Design a protein around this nucleic acid. Structure first.
Length: 129
RNA sequence: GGGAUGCUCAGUGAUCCUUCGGGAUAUCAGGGCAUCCC
C-alpha cells in the first residue's frame, strides 16, 4: 500500500479526463510534493481542506492555451519495499532538465536541481514531466 | 489486532554530506504521546 503512488495516480487520471480538481488524503510528504508542483508550475494550486480526520489536499490542475496539459507524466520511483537512493552526483535528470525529479533530502523535499545545488542526495520519490 | 495520520525524541540501523575529526534528519526503521478508520 503506497499513498504517494496513489496521489500520483489520482493526478494522472484527473489529467487524462482533464478535470479541474481532485482530492487526496493529506499527509506532510504529499503536502510537500503538491507544493513543489505548484512552485514548478505543474499544477495551478493546492490547498488544505479541513475535515477533523486527517485533512484533504484539493489540487487544481493546469491546462494551457488550447487545452494543452501542462503535466505529461508522473512516475513513482522510490517504493515501499524497494526504496531508491541517490548520492549527490547521482541524482537523476528527468528528460534532460525539462522534467523534475522529486528528491527527499535531510533538508526537505526539493527538485533535482535544488539537490545538486545544495550538493545533497536522498530518496528519489518521483518523476514529473 | 490491522491500517492511516499528527506532535515529539533520539540517532547509525537505512539514507545523505564530509576536511574521516565528524556532521544532516526529509523519507525508511526505532522511542514517547495523540487523533481518525475497520
Amino acid at each position: 500500500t503506497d499513498p504517494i503512488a496513489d496521489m500520483l495516480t489520482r493526478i494522472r487520471n484527473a489529467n487524462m479526463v482533464r478535470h479541474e480538481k481532485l482530492e487526496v488524503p493529506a499527509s506532510k510528504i504529499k503536502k510537500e510534493i503538491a507544493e513543489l508542483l505548484k512552485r514548478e508550475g505543474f499544477i495551478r494550486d493546492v490547498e488544505y481542506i479541513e475535515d477533523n480526520k486527517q485533512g484533504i489536499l484539493r489540487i487544481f490542475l493546469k491546462y494551457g492555451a488550447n487545452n494543452e496539459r501542462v503535466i505529461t507524466g508522473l512516475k513513482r520511483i522510490s517504493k515501499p519495499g524497494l526504496r531508491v537512493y541517490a548520492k549527490a552526483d547521482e541524482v537523476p535528470r528527468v528528460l534532460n532538465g525539462l522534467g523534475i525529479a522529486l528528491v527527499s533530502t535531510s533538508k526537505g523535499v526539493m527538485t533535482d536541481k535544488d539537490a545538486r545545488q545544495l550538493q545533497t542526495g536522498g530518496e528519489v520519490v518521483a518523476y514529473v514531466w
